[PDB]
Design a protein around this ligand. Structure first.
Ligand SMILES: [Cl-]
Ligand SMILES: [Cl-]
Ligand SMILES: [Cl-]
Ligand SMILES: [Cl-]
Ligand SMILES: [Cl-]
Ligand code: NA
Ligand code: NA
Ligand SMILES: [Zn+2]
Ligand SMILES: [Zn+2]
Lengths: 176, 177
């Protein structure tokens, strides 16, 4: 961050009194500019015993597979965000069900929230961020070609736990 | 937002082609400025059958009770955030346990995450954000003096479910007041 969004002055890194870490502050308007982590919302679209994955079109990891997911926007709920991201990436209509996974990615100041979801029809197809979209049985999922560990781990757990009953919600951490 | 954080130019609001909502864009450096919701992490510190609440020193609703809670920071996990906000508001050491409540406040683009917590000792006292901090049993909670609906609602549910069993995690939505 180079400039102040409120007045256009150049910002500088200072540790406020009582704190131990720097914040960008603006000496022209005398205000502190806080940075906060970002939420990524998405879901596991289920159809019969299959799940919908998307092959990414945009780096990083083009050609690798993932779940519909992306940055939450302002003026929406978590559920609204997950359904919107699914429609945008996969042209797919889902009903969002239980929150399944919450992951902290502290190194990149991200939080992933992954919901269970019911695919409502098969009339789906790639949006611009996707090369392709399709349903996979558990034995079809290309585990080695999943883009992100934050997607790979909860998905594998989900598929495996649901042989035994309704997968239990869990909280994860992926470090650098 | 008035100026570009990257070049200092004035930003303007415009709807990108293919979109319906406006974004801040900078015509000088030709970039879009995305604004995103903010997480507030907190917890319900439990000691025996009581919970720790804090009386607010700083508006809005100073004089009102809340749970320890605050904006998550960069380079921390959700659990660290919860433990950190409680140490800061109340000088209380907690062990963070299960996530209990996740609320969306779309009108102000916030998400609250509240964890159950074990209070590790009684050697707690106000931080600067708080006038007072203390333990309340269910019959002592000043329900009508709780600052925010997003705190009141889950805590009331928590104290209810606590009677029938060990409280089930839930998602909530609080729409504009
Ligand atoms: Cl929601
Ligand atoms: Cl849920
Ligand atoms: Cl965590
Ligand atoms: Cl948990
Ligand atoms: Cl509220
Ligand atoms: Na997105
Ligand atoms: Na804080
Ligand atoms: Zn300024
Ligand atoms: Zn600019």
């Amino acid at each position: 961050m180079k400039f102040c969004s409120q007045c256009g002055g150049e910002v500088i890194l200072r540790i406020p009194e009582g704190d131990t870490l720097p914040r960008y502050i603006c000496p022209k308007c005398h205000t502190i500019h806080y940075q906060n982590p970002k939420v990524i919302v998405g879901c596991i679209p289920e159809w019969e015993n299959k799940v919908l994955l998307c092959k990414r079109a945009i780096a990083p990891y083009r050609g690798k597979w993932t779940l519909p997911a992306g940055f939450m926007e302002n003026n929406e709920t978590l559920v609204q965000g997950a359904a919107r991201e699914t429609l945008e990436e996969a042209n797919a209509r889902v009903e969002i069900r239980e929150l399944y996974a919450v992951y902290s990615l502290p190194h990149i100041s991200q939080v992933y929230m992954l919901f269970r979801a019911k695919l409502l029809d098969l009339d789906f197809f790639p949006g611009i961020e996707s090369l392709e979209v399709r349903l996979f049985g558990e034995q079809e999922i290309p585990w080695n070609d999943i883009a992100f560990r934050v997607i790979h781990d909860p998905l594998k757990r989900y598929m495996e736990e649901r042989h035994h009953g309704q997968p239990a919600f869990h909280l994860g951490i992926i470090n650098k």
